[PDB]
Every structure is written in structure tokens, then in C-alpha cells.
Amino acid sequence: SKTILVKMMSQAGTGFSFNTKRSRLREKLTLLHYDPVVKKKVLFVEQKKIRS
Template sequence: MASKSSDIRPVITMRSTEGTGFTYTTRKNRRNTPDRLELMKYDPVVKKRVIFRETR
């Protein structure tokens, strides 16, 4: 069985770029997306869609 640290689809944390501290958690495929992920998602603190970046 593969260890969790070398998992192909690790759990990552997405943090808001607006500085609100709001986060989402998701999974990504390391083989298809080796770079840090950036997604437009809804931030309920500022009540609008903003860019969320992957944190490590």
C-alpha cells in the first residue's frame, strides 16, 4: 500500500488571496498538475468570487 506522503492525489488547502483567511480543501493529481493550483471560488467573507491559491 502506498504511503500518504507519496500519494498521487494529495489533499491540498486553497487559501483566499483577499487575506480573509478563508480556506477550501480539495484533492489534486500531481502528475497532471505539478504546479500550484489557482481557482476562482466564492469567498463568503467578502461575498464575491476571488482567486484561491494552493498553500503547502
């Protein structure tokens, strides 16, 4: 059961990325996070894969 480390970039326009752990057998992850630049709940999508 190997996981993956993925960097998510905000879709609120401002450049803000955070790293989160995800299962390898999952699809592209998309969640709701907090963006300090705009201070609002913003949809985040998986942009890069960094660590296994």
C-alpha cells in the same frame, strides 16, 4: 494515478481556506472560488499540502 489534498487560502485578505483534491503530477493549483466573508468571486491559490 495518485492524487493529493491541498488547502487553498483566499487572496481577498480575509482568512478563509478550503481543501480540494488535485493530481500529484500537476503544478501549483490556482482557481476561482467563492469567499463567504466578502461574498465575491476570489482567486484562490494552493497554500498547503495535507493528505496524499
